Structures are given as C-alpha cells and as structure tokens.
PDB file of C-alpha atoms and ligand atoms in Angstrom:
ATOM      1  CA  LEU A 127     120.968 122.895  92.102  1.00 31.42           C
ATOM      2  CA  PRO A 128     121.889 122.334  88.136  1.00 28.77           C
ATOM      3  CA  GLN A 129     119.234 123.678  85.900  1.00 26.53           C
ATOM      4  CA  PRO A 130     117.559 120.742  84.185  1.00 25.08           C
ATOM      5  CA  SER A 131     116.944 120.517  80.476  1.00 24.42           C
ATOM      6  CA  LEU A 132     114.131 119.307  78.460  1.00 24.78           C
ATOM      7  CA  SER A 133     113.752 117.573  75.050  1.00 24.74           C
ATOM      8  CA  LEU A 134     110.547 116.972  72.969  1.00 22.22           C
ATOM      9  CA  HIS A 135     110.204 114.136  70.585  1.00 22.98           C
ATOM     10  CA  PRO A 136     108.731 114.129  68.130  1.00 24.72           C
ATOM     11  CA  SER A 137     109.061 117.801  67.635  1.00 26.44           C
ATOM     12  CA  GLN A 138     108.146 118.177  63.997  1.00 27.76           C
ATOM     13  CA  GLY A 139     104.803 117.741  62.079  1.00 27.70           C
ATOM     14  CA  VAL A 140     103.093 116.901  65.423  1.00 27.96           C
ATOM     15  CA  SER A 141      99.265 116.804  65.292  1.00 28.59           C
ATOM     16  CA  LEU A 142      96.280 115.771  67.372  1.00 29.99           C
ATOM     17  CA  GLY A 143      96.247 112.125  68.224  1.00 30.88           C
ATOM     18  CA  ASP A 144      99.876 111.778  68.216  1.00 29.78           C
ATOM     19  CA  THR A 145     101.974 110.852  71.347  1.00 29.44           C
ATOM     20  CA  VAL A 146     104.712 113.094  72.571  1.00 29.93           C
ATOM     21  CA  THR A 147     107.515 112.620  74.899  1.00 34.13           C
ATOM     22  CA  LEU A 148     108.984 115.385  77.152  1.00 35.66           C
ATOM     23  CA  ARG A 149     112.168 114.109  78.675  1.00 39.73           C
ATOM     24  CA  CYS A 150     113.537 116.032  81.420  1.00 40.30           C
ATOM     25  CA  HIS A 151     117.296 115.536  82.159  1.00 40.33           C
ATOM     26  CA  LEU A 152     118.675 116.005  85.639  1.00 38.29           C
ATOM     27  CA  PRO A 153     121.427 114.533  87.904  1.00 31.34           C
ATOM     28  CA  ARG A 154     121.259 110.978  89.533  1.00 31.57           C
ATOM     29  CA  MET A 155     119.561 112.071  92.791  1.00 34.08           C
ATOM     30  CA  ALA A 156     115.915 111.211  93.896  1.00 35.96           C
ATOM     31  CA  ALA A 157     113.650 113.906  93.055  1.00 34.42           C
ATOM     32  CA  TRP A 158     110.178 115.264  92.436  1.00 37.01           C
ATOM     33  CA  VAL A 159     109.996 116.336  88.477  1.00 36.86           C
ATOM     34  CA  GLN A 160     107.388 118.810  87.397  1.00 40.79           C
ATOM     35  CA  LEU A 161     106.476 119.581  83.736  1.00 41.47           C
ATOM     36  CA  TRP A 162     105.058 123.063  83.397  1.00 40.36           C
ATOM     37  CA  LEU A 163     103.038 124.466  80.301  1.00 40.83           C
ATOM     38  CA  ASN A 164     102.617 128.036  79.662  1.00 42.34           C
ATOM     39  CA  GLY A 165     103.935 128.832  83.205  1.00 44.43           C
ATOM     40  CA  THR A 166     101.508 126.446  85.195  1.00 44.82           C
ATOM     41  CA  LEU A 167     102.331 123.159  86.492  1.00 44.98           C
ATOM     42  CA  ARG A 168     100.784 120.482  84.232  1.00 45.55           C
ATOM     43  CA  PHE A 169     102.159 116.912  85.624  1.00 44.30           C
ATOM     44  CA  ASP A 170     104.610 115.821  88.323  1.00 44.33           C
ATOM     45  CA  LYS A 171     106.255 112.600  89.026  1.00 43.79           C
ATOM     46  CA  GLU A 172     108.857 110.769  91.008  1.00 46.02           C
ATOM     47  CA  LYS A 173     112.412 110.157  89.517  1.00 46.03           C
ATOM     48  CA  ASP A 174     114.353 107.424  91.252  1.00 44.08           C
ATOM     49  CA  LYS A 175     117.895 108.221  91.991  1.00 47.99           C
ATOM     50  CA  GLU A 176     119.304 105.973  89.383  1.00 46.12           C
ATOM     51  CA  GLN A 177     117.352 107.555  86.452  1.00 48.07           C
ATOM     52  CA  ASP A 178     119.120 110.120  84.229  1.00 47.26           C
ATOM     53  CA  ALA A 179     115.616 111.666  83.252  1.00 47.09           C
ATOM     54  CA  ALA A 180     111.856 111.819  84.111  1.00 46.25           C
ATOM     55  CA  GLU A 181     109.803 111.185  80.957  1.00 45.55           C
ATOM     56  CA  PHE A 182     106.505 112.753  80.590  1.00 41.07           C
ATOM     57  CA  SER A 183     104.588 110.889  77.726  1.00 40.18           C
ATOM     58  CA  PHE A 184     101.187 111.917  76.665  1.00 39.55           C
ATOM     59  CA  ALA A 185      98.700 111.941  73.681  1.00 36.33           C
ATOM     60  CA  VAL A 186      98.005 115.364  72.245  1.00 37.68           C
ATOM     61  CA  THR A 187      94.218 115.372  72.470  1.00 37.02           C
ATOM     62  CA  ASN A 188      93.389 119.124  71.936  1.00 36.94           C
ATOM     63  CA  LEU A 189      94.702 122.511  70.684  1.00 36.90           C
ATOM     64  CA  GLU A 190      95.525 123.645  74.128  1.00 36.86           C
ATOM     65  CA  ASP A 191      98.342 120.984  74.247  1.00 37.95           C
ATOM     66  CA  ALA A 192     100.293 123.370  72.076  1.00 38.42           C
ATOM     67  CA  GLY A 193     102.696 125.966  73.927  1.00 39.74           C
ATOM     68  CA  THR A 194     105.788 126.552  76.058  1.00 41.20           C
ATOM     69  CA  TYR A 195     107.032 123.542  77.946  1.00 40.41           C
ATOM     70  CA  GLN A 196     109.440 123.668  80.833  1.00 41.63           C
ATOM     71  CA  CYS A 197     110.724 121.369  83.667  1.00 41.62           C
ATOM     72  CA  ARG A 198     111.816 121.882  87.315  1.00 43.07           C
ATOM     73  CA  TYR A 199     112.861 119.499  89.980  1.00 46.40           C
ATOM     74  CA  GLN A 200     112.833 119.425  93.793  1.00 48.33           C
ATOM     75  CA  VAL A 201     114.382 117.672  96.793  1.00 48.17           C
ATOM     76  CA  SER A 202     113.738 117.935 100.333  1.00 49.95           C
ATOM     77  CA  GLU A 203     116.970 116.987 101.775  1.00 52.11           C
ATOM     78  CA  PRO A 204     118.279 119.736 101.464  1.00 51.88           C
ATOM     79  CA  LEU A 205     114.963 121.944 100.706  1.00 51.50           C
ATOM     80  CA  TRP A 206     116.027 122.977  97.175  1.00 50.86           C
ATOM     81  CA  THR A 207     114.290 123.582  93.868  1.00 48.47           C
ATOM     82  CA  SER A 208     115.881 123.953  90.369  1.00 48.01           C
ATOM     83  CA  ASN A 209     115.079 126.759  88.131  1.00 46.42           C
ATOM     84  CA  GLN A 210     113.090 125.976  85.049  1.00 46.15           C
ATOM     85  CA  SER A 211     114.587 124.451  82.161  1.00 46.64           C
ATOM     86  CA  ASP A 212     114.999 126.645  78.992  1.00 45.23           C
ATOM     87  CA  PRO A 213     111.808 126.187  77.093  1.00 46.24           C
ATOM     88  CA  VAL A 214     110.879 123.730  74.287  1.00 45.66           C
ATOM     89  CA  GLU A 215     107.732 124.539  72.344  1.00 43.22           C
ATOM     90  CA  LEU A 216     105.145 121.907  70.983  1.00 42.79           C
ATOM     91  CA  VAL A 217     103.821 123.504  67.813  1.00 42.56           C
ATOM     92  CA  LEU A 218     100.760 121.479  66.384  1.00 43.19           C
ATOM     93  CA  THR A 219     100.211 120.626  62.535  1.00 40.96           C
TER      94      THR A 219
ATOM     95  CA  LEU B  84     102.099 110.190 104.394  1.00 44.80           C
ATOM     96  CA  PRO B  85      99.546 111.739 106.464  1.00 45.71           C
ATOM     97  CA  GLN B  86      96.990 113.942 104.655  1.00 45.54           C
ATOM     98  CA  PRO B  87      97.488 117.630 105.497  1.00 46.32           C
ATOM     99  CA  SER B  88      94.790 119.942 106.545  1.00 50.78           C
ATOM    100  CA  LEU B  89      94.171 123.527 105.445  1.00 49.10           C
ATOM    101  CA  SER B  90      92.605 126.513 107.228  1.00 47.57           C
ATOM    102  CA  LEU B  91      91.617 129.891 105.923  1.00 48.74           C
ATOM    103  CA  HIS B  92      91.712 133.241 107.959  1.00 48.37           C
ATOM    104  CA  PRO B  93      89.724 135.218 107.491  1.00 49.46           C
ATOM    105  CA  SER B  94      87.059 133.259 105.830  1.00 52.66           C
ATOM    106  CA  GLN B  95      83.948 135.330 106.285  1.00 50.99           C
ATOM    107  CA  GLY B  96      83.184 138.806 104.654  1.00 49.31           C
ATOM    108  CA  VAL B  97      86.518 138.630 102.555  1.00 49.05           C
ATOM    109  CA  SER B  98      86.648 141.360  99.795  1.00 48.33           C
ATOM    110  CA  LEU B  99      89.057 142.367  97.140  1.00 48.29           C
ATOM    111  CA  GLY B 100      92.121 144.254  98.884  1.00 49.31           C
ATOM    112  CA  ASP B 101      91.835 141.962 102.027  1.00 47.77           C
ATOM    113  CA  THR B 102      94.822 139.852 102.820  1.00 46.43           C
ATOM    114  CA  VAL B 103      94.207 136.216 103.488  1.00 47.00           C
ATOM    115  CA  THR B 104      96.224 133.233 105.092  1.00 42.33           C
ATOM    116  CA  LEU B 105      96.022 129.729 104.058  1.00 42.76           C
ATOM    117  CA  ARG B 106      97.608 127.469 106.451  1.00 45.99           C
ATOM    118  CA  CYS B 107      98.645 124.239 105.883  1.00 46.92           C
ATOM    119  CA  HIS B 108      99.301 121.840 108.609  1.00 49.19           C
ATOM    120  CA  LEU B 109     101.565 118.706 108.192  1.00 48.39           C
ATOM    121  CA  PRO B 110     104.029 116.781 110.245  1.00 46.35           C
ATOM    122  CA  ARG B 111     107.417 118.098 111.584  1.00 46.55           C
ATOM    123  CA  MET B 112     109.384 116.820 108.296  1.00 46.85           C
ATOM    124  CA  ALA B 113     111.223 119.110 105.878  1.00 47.03           C
ATOM    125  CA  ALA B 114     108.823 119.280 103.005  1.00 48.78           C
ATOM    126  CA  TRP B 115     107.966 121.224  99.672  1.00 49.93           C
ATOM    127  CA  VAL B 116     104.208 122.395 100.254  1.00 50.23           C
ATOM    128  CA  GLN B 117     101.951 123.400  97.555  1.00 54.67           C
ATOM    129  CA  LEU B 118      98.863 125.438  97.435  1.00 51.89           C
ATOM    130  CA  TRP B 119      96.348 124.496  94.855  1.00 52.83           C
ATOM    131  CA  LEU B 120      93.431 126.639  93.351  1.00 52.18           C
ATOM    132  CA  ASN B 121      90.573 124.840  91.541  1.00 47.89           C
ATOM    133  CA  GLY B 122      92.775 121.818  91.078  1.00 46.73           C
ATOM    134  CA  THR B 123      95.738 123.582  89.549  1.00 45.94           C
ATOM    135  CA  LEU B 124      98.879 124.543  91.507  1.00 47.75           C
ATOM    136  CA  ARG B 125      99.146 128.117  92.421  1.00 47.52           C
ATOM    137  CA  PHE B 126     102.092 128.633  95.030  1.00 47.85           C
ATOM    138  CA  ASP B 127     104.507 126.284  96.443  1.00 45.75           C
ATOM    139  CA  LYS B 128     107.252 127.090  99.310  1.00 46.52           C
ATOM    140  CA  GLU B 129     109.569 125.110 101.573  1.00 48.17           C
ATOM    141  CA  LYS B 130     108.758 124.307 104.956  1.00 48.98           C
ATOM    142  CA  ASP B 131     111.570 123.791 107.413  1.00 48.48           C
ATOM    143  CA  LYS B 132     111.523 120.507 109.365  1.00 44.19           C
ATOM    144  CA  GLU B 133     110.522 122.358 112.855  1.00 43.94           C
ATOM    145  CA  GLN B 134     107.475 124.129 111.680  1.00 46.30           C
ATOM    146  CA  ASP B 135     104.008 122.683 112.264  1.00 47.18           C
ATOM    147  CA  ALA B 136     102.753 124.410 109.003  1.00 49.68           C
ATOM    148  CA  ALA B 137     103.519 126.346 105.827  1.00 51.98           C
ATOM    149  CA  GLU B 138     101.522 129.591 105.558  1.00 49.93           C
ATOM    150  CA  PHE B 139     100.585 131.093 102.014  1.00 49.73           C
ATOM    151  CA  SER B 140      99.418 134.764 102.780  1.00 49.30           C
ATOM    152  CA  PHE B 141      98.699 136.886  99.915  1.00 50.01           C
ATOM    153  CA  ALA B 142      96.336 139.835  98.904  1.00 53.67           C
ATOM    154  CA  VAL B 143      93.075 139.161  97.351  1.00 55.52           C
ATOM    155  CA  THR B 144      93.455 141.294  94.164  1.00 54.03           C
ATOM    156  CA  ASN B 145      90.707 139.946  91.550  1.00 49.70           C
ATOM    157  CA  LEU B 146      87.715 137.942  91.409  1.00 51.63           C
ATOM    158  CA  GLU B 147      89.581 134.786  90.361  1.00 53.37           C
ATOM    159  CA  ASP B 148      90.960 134.451  93.569  1.00 54.38           C
ATOM    160  CA  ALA B 149      87.641 132.960  94.717  1.00 53.69           C
ATOM    161  CA  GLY B 150      87.390 129.132  94.611  1.00 53.84           C
ATOM    162  CA  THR B 151      88.477 126.008  96.185  1.00 53.01           C
ATOM    163  CA  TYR B 152      91.758 125.554  97.884  1.00 52.82           C
ATOM    164  CA  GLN B 153      93.729 122.682  98.783  1.00 53.58           C
ATOM    165  CA  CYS B 154      97.117 121.705  99.939  1.00 58.62           C
ATOM    166  CA  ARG B 155      99.475 118.772  99.256  1.00 60.86           C
ATOM    167  CA  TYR B 156     102.975 118.239 100.541  1.00 60.14           C
ATOM    168  CA  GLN B 157     106.029 116.296  99.031  1.00 57.35           C
ATOM    169  CA  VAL B 158     109.363 114.805 100.097  1.00 56.03           C
ATOM    170  CA  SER B 159     112.210 113.161  98.170  1.00 60.76           C
ATOM    171  CA  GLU B 160     113.630 111.000 100.943  1.00 58.85           C
ATOM    172  CA  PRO B 161     111.598 108.806 100.471  1.00 55.47           C
ATOM    173  CA  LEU B 162     109.681 109.718  97.389  1.00 58.54           C
ATOM    174  CA  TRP B 163     106.408 110.312  98.575  1.00 56.20           C
ATOM    175  CA  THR B 164     103.420 112.836  98.008  1.00 55.91           C
ATOM    176  CA  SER B 165     100.489 113.430 100.247  1.00 54.28           C
ATOM    177  CA  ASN B 166      96.843 113.509  98.818  1.00 54.73           C
ATOM    178  CA  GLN B 167      95.258 116.925  98.662  1.00 55.40           C
ATOM    179  CA  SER B 168      93.736 118.293 101.895  1.00 56.03           C
ATOM    180  CA  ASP B 169      89.967 118.459 102.161  1.00 59.44           C
ATOM    181  CA  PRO B 170      89.124 121.773 100.453  1.00 58.46           C
ATOM    182  CA  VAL B 171      88.615 125.147 101.937  1.00 60.10           C
ATOM    183  CA  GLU B 172      86.549 127.696  99.772  1.00 63.88           C
ATOM    184  CA  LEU B 173      87.382 131.494  99.428  1.00 62.78           C
ATOM    185  CA  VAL B 174      84.063 133.231  98.990  1.00 65.27           C
ATOM    186  CA  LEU B 175      84.408 136.879  98.109  1.00 63.59           C
ATOM    187  CA  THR B 176      82.172 139.636  99.462  1.00 64.52           C
TER     188      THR B 176
HETATM  189  C1  LIG C 412      99.685 127.701  75.865  1.00 62.33           C
HETATM  190  O1  LIG C 412      99.932 128.676  74.881  1.00 62.33           O
HETATM  191  C2  LIG C 412      99.689 128.303  73.528  1.00 62.33           C
HETATM  192  C3  LIG C 412     100.245 129.211  72.646  1.00 62.33           C
HETATM  193  O2  LIG C 412      99.624 130.740  72.915  1.00 62.33           O
HETATM  194  C4  LIG C 412      98.050 127.989  73.328  1.00 62.33           C
HETATM  195  O3  LIG C 412      97.798 127.748  72.033  1.00 62.33           O
HETATM  196  C5  LIG C 412      96.736 127.773  71.333  1.00 62.33           C
HETATM  197  O4  LIG C 412      95.462 128.044  72.062  1.00 62.33           O
HETATM  198  C6  LIG C 412      94.481 128.500  71.440  1.00 62.33           C
HETATM  199  C7  LIG C 412      93.171 128.089  72.411  1.00 62.33           C
HETATM  200  O5  LIG C 412      92.766 126.837  71.863  1.00 62.33           O
HETATM  201  C8  LIG C 412      94.256 128.607  69.955  1.00 62.33           C
HETATM  202  O6  LIG C 412      93.200 129.309  69.532  1.00 62.33           O
HETATM  203  C9  LIG C 412      92.200 128.718  69.232  1.00 62.33           C
HETATM  204  O7  LIG C 412      92.151 128.354  67.846  1.00 62.33           O
HETATM  205  C10 LIG C 412      90.887 127.557  67.341  1.00 62.33           C
HETATM  206  C11 LIG C 412      91.156 126.999  65.846  1.00 62.33           C
HETATM  207  O8  LIG C 412      91.454 128.272  65.120  1.00 62.33           O
HETATM  208  C12 LIG C 412      89.782 128.450  67.240  1.00 62.33           C
HETATM  209  O9  LIG C 412      88.551 127.826  66.887  1.00 62.33           O
HETATM  210  C13 LIG C 412      89.717 129.052  68.718  1.00 62.33           C
HETATM  211  O10 LIG C 412      88.572 129.984  68.963  1.00 62.33           O
HETATM  212  C14 LIG C 412      90.966 129.740  69.210  1.00 62.33           C
HETATM  213  O11 LIG C 412      91.292 130.863  68.464  1.00 62.33           O
HETATM  214  C15 LIG C 412      95.615 128.883  69.482  1.00 62.33           C
HETATM  215  O12 LIG C 412      95.488 128.860  67.929  1.00 62.33           O
HETATM  216  C16 LIG C 412      96.788 128.176  69.855  1.00 62.33           C
HETATM  217  N1  LIG C 412      97.840 128.770  69.638  1.00 62.33           N
HETATM  218  C17 LIG C 412      99.134 128.001  68.909  1.00 62.33           C
HETATM  219  C18 LIG C 412     100.207 128.745  68.651  1.00 62.33           C
HETATM  220  O13 LIG C 412      98.863 126.783  68.974  1.00 62.33           O
HETATM  221  C19 LIG C 412      97.608 126.881  74.338  1.00 62.33           C
HETATM  222  O14 LIG C 412      96.018 126.899  74.507  1.00 62.33           O
HETATM  223  C20 LIG C 412      98.166 127.222  75.767  1.00 62.33           C
HETATM  224  N2  LIG C 412      97.753 125.989  76.407  1.00 62.33           N
HETATM  225  C21 LIG C 412      97.284 126.217  77.720  1.00 62.33           C
HETATM  226  C22 LIG C 412      97.311 127.361  78.724  1.00 62.33           C
HETATM  227  O15 LIG C 412      96.941 124.976  78.448  1.00 62.33           O
HETATM  228  C1  LIG C 413      88.065 129.104  90.920  1.00 58.48           C
HETATM  229  O1  LIG C 413      86.788 128.889  90.603  1.00 58.48           O
HETATM  230  C2  LIG C 413      85.947 129.843  91.053  1.00 58.48           C
HETATM  231  C3  LIG C 413      84.358 129.316  91.414  1.00 58.48           C
HETATM  232  O2  LIG C 413      83.839 129.011  90.011  1.00 58.48           O
HETATM  233  C4  LIG C 413      86.021 131.047  90.161  1.00 58.48           C
HETATM  234  O3  LIG C 413      85.170 132.026  90.773  1.00 58.48           O
HETATM  235  C5  LIG C 413      84.793 133.154  89.929  1.00 58.48           C
HETATM  236  O4  LIG C 413      85.135 133.211  88.599  1.00 58.48           O
HETATM  237  C6  LIG C 413      84.627 134.039  87.709  1.00 58.48           C
HETATM  238  C7  LIG C 413      85.623 134.704  86.690  1.00 58.48           C
HETATM  239  O5  LIG C 413      85.990 135.925  87.177  1.00 58.48           O
HETATM  240  C8  LIG C 413      83.189 135.010  88.068  1.00 58.48           C
HETATM  241  O6  LIG C 413      82.374 135.554  87.035  1.00 58.48           O
HETATM  242  C9  LIG C 413      82.782 136.714  86.537  1.00 58.48           C
HETATM  243  O7  LIG C 413      81.917 137.434  87.448  1.00 58.48           O
HETATM  244  C10 LIG C 413      82.120 138.892  87.090  1.00 58.48           C
HETATM  245  C11 LIG C 413      81.148 139.690  87.894  1.00 58.48           C
HETATM  246  O8  LIG C 413      79.642 139.339  87.894  1.00 58.48           O
HETATM  247  C12 LIG C 413      81.477 139.170  85.644  1.00 58.48           C
HETATM  248  O9  LIG C 413      81.524 140.479  85.205  1.00 58.48           O
HETATM  249  C13 LIG C 413      82.482 138.188  84.785  1.00 58.48           C
HETATM  250  O10 LIG C 413      82.015 138.319  83.205  1.00 58.48           O
HETATM  251  C14 LIG C 413      82.346 136.712  85.323  1.00 58.48           C
HETATM  252  O11 LIG C 413      81.175 136.209  84.879  1.00 58.48           O
HETATM  253  C15 LIG C 413      82.426 134.275  89.061  1.00 58.48           C
HETATM  254  O12 LIG C 413      81.552 135.110  89.854  1.00 58.48           O
HETATM  255  C16 LIG C 413      83.206 133.667  90.138  1.00 58.48           C
HETATM  256  N1  LIG C 413      82.406 132.655  90.987  1.00 58.48           N
HETATM  257  C17 LIG C 413      82.473 132.790  92.252  1.00 58.48           C
HETATM  258  C18 LIG C 413      81.653 131.713  93.007  1.00 58.48           C
HETATM  259  O13 LIG C 413      83.041 133.679  93.037  1.00 58.48           O
HETATM  260  C19 LIG C 413      87.357 131.578  89.906  1.00 58.48           C
HETATM  261  O14 LIG C 413      87.605 132.430  88.858  1.00 58.48           O
HETATM  262  C20 LIG C 413      88.330 130.273  89.626  1.00 58.48           C
HETATM  263  N2  LIG C 413      89.827 130.800  89.939  1.00 58.48           N
HETATM  264  C21 LIG C 413      90.797 130.621  89.120  1.00 58.48           C
HETATM  265  C22 LIG C 413      90.330 129.184  88.351  1.00 58.48           C
HETATM  266  O15 LIG C 413      91.792 130.703  89.293  1.00 58.48           O
END
C-alpha cells in the first residue's frame, strides 16, 4: 500500500475566512480517504477508483484550524490501510 | 449497509485501572471498524469477513475515557459507510 501525499493550496498568507484545499494523492483504486489534523481524524470521504486524489476543501473559520495535516487511505479488499502522508502545516495569517 | 450495534462489558462499577471491551457487531463482510468517543474517532481496526464483531479492549487510564461510545464500519467495494451505532455510555466509578 503506497504512502499517500498531501498538498495544501493556498499555503501562504492564509487567514480566517479563506477557503483551503487539502488534496490527497493516491493510486487509482476505490478507497476511503481520511484527513487528520494534529493526529486526530477530521474528515473522511470516498474516492472513486478513477480519481487521482480526494480533495478536502473547507473554509478556515477559527484559530484551531491551524496545525499539522496528514492523509491516510483504506480499502477492505484486501484489508489494508496506508501510513499517514508526510505532514503539511496550515499556518494562519 | 445495516447499522452496527455496540455493547460494553463491564458497564457497571467501572473504575480507573479496569479493562473494558467495546464489541461492535456487524455483518460477515470484511470491513474497517471504527470506535468513536464523544463524536471523534478513537480507534479503528480490521474485521476479517468471518468475524461477527470487532472488539476494542483497552484499559481505563484516565477520567477522559468516560463518555459516549459509538461504532461505524466501512467497505471500499462498494464504497459504503454505515451510520453510527446507537450510543453506549462509559460511566466511571
Ligand atoms: C492543532 O495544533 C495547532 C498548533 O499547536 C493549534 O494551533 C493554535 O491553537 C491555539 C488554540 O486556539 C492557539 O492559541 C490561542 O491563541 C489565541 C490568540 O492568541 C489566544 O487568545 C488563546 O487563548 C490561545 O492561546 C495558538 O495560537 C495556535 N497555534 C498556532 C501555531 O496557530 C490548533 O489549535 C490545533 N487544532 C486542533 C487540535 O484542532
Ligand atoms: C467525553 O465526554 C465525557 C462526558 O462529558 C467527558 O467526561 C469527563 O471529562 C472531564 C475532563 O476530565 C471531567 O471533569 C474533570 O473532573 C475532574 C474531577 O472532578 C476535575 O478535577 C477536572 O478539573 C474536570 O472538571 C468530568 O468529570 C467527566 N464527566 C463525566 C460524566 O465523566 C470526557 O472527558 C470526554 N472524553 C474525551 C473527549 O476524550
């Protein structure tokens, strides 16, 4: 199970009220993709087999949105999970 | 996707230092099973297709172990998630 990689856009000068996109890149298999913040699961979503990535887009609405983002993915046939992606940091303001 | 159900043993007179088992009952399909505490993911693990349940057994090590436990399960073929189980409350002492 290949380690996913995570990108953040925008990554510089992000402020409250801005919308950010965390794009989790993984293989073209159907999978449940998770976004983790500070070592705790924040969001998950389905990624159809044909997609190259799952994207988590959200508004920055408070100071606790800052921190260390990672992504992980899982399949049930076989019963496998990836390791966490290398981290990407959301720094506010 | 049938809603899972969760049991807790022991459920009465539980104290710090005791070991509890949260047993998540679901169908005989291979699946990733999650244990959630107070609406945030705590643990996950694989459940082999032949198992009737995934069990999360852990020691009660602090007061923050108390609260509302639920379980959820997911498969990637098809890309489906259950709803949360009805809640079971761990009450300490
Ligand atoms: C993920 O970890 C982040 C990095 O530690 C953490 O970042 C921030 O969280 C706290 C809580 O909001 C901020 O501290 C507050 O700052 C305000 C303004 O000064 C104070 O009024 C308040 O009392 C408190 O000190 C930190 O400034 C901030 N740190 C950084 C680098 O942005 C996230 O909260 C955390 N997110 C989670 C766990 O969901
Ligand atoms: C999941 O929700 C639980 C129910 O709200 C929560 O329960 C408990 O959490 C707090 C934090 O430890 C306890 O309050 C503390 O009590 C000690 C002893 O009096 C104080 O010294 C301390 O300052 C603080 O008030 C609550 O007593 C307790 N409530 C119950 C019903 O057990 C869990 O913390 C929470 N678990 C999570 C989010 O991981």
